[PDB]
Amino acid sequence: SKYMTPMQQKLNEVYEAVKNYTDKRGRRLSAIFLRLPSRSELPDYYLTIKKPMDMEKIRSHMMANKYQDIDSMVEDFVMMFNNACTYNEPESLIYKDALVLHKVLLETRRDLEGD
């Protein structure tokens, strides 16, 4: 069925809000977060980050219909942002972007509180 339940629509809107957010200069903050690079490409990432997470993984779980609720999806986003903030330095752009996107995530959830 092409029709999403309300819970599915909400999950999609949250996801899409983070994905599509662009700053005043037209930059899409989510670009770097979509797909994690490999073990070779990011030294020490997978030894040091306990639960790797990227937006493609989140998107797949959503498409397979495995978030039972909004908080579960939020959890995964927060894990991703924390991972990025653990691995990268505060001065790095990825770290700054993770902070903005975290605010985008919570604002969006909060805005959709009564759907």
Ligand X SMILES: O=c1cc(-c2ccc(O)c(O)c2)oc2cc(O)cc(O)c12
- Select the span of 1-9, 10-18, 58-66, 82-90 touching ligand X (CB under 6 A): 82-90
Minimum CB separation of residue 24 from ligand X in Å reads 23
**Taking CB under 6 A as the criterion, which residues in 47-66 touch ligand X?**
54
Residue 97 makes contact with ligand X by CB under 6 A: no
* Count of residues that interact with ligand X, criterion CB under 6 A: 12
Which is nearest to 84 in space by CA: 43, 49, 47? 49
- Select the span of 11-19, 36-44, 61-69, 105-113 touching ligand X (CB under 6 A): 36-44
**Cβ(46)–Cβ(39) below 8 Å:** yes
Query: What residues make contact with ligand X under the rule CB under 6 A?
Result: 32-33, 36-37, 42, 54, 80, 83-84, 87-88, 94
